[PDB]
Structure formats: structure tokens, C-alpha cells
């Protein structure tokens, strides 16, 4: 219920040169 997938919670999950 409400999954949360920002690079591994580390945000800026956008095309930001390999955020992982």
C-alpha cells in the first residue's frame, strides 16, 4: 500500500546522471 521508489530513498530520482 503506497510504495515509495525515489532512488532508493536518497531522492532527486529524475534522470540525474545514474541516481541509484
Do not use: D, L, P, Q
Not at 500500500?1 to 541509484?20: D, G, L, P, V
Request: proline share 0%; no cysteine; charged share 20%.
Amino acid at each position: 500500500k503506497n510504495e515509495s521508489k525515489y532512488s532508493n530513498t536518497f531522492i532527486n530520482n529524475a534522470y540525474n546522471m545514474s541516481i541509484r
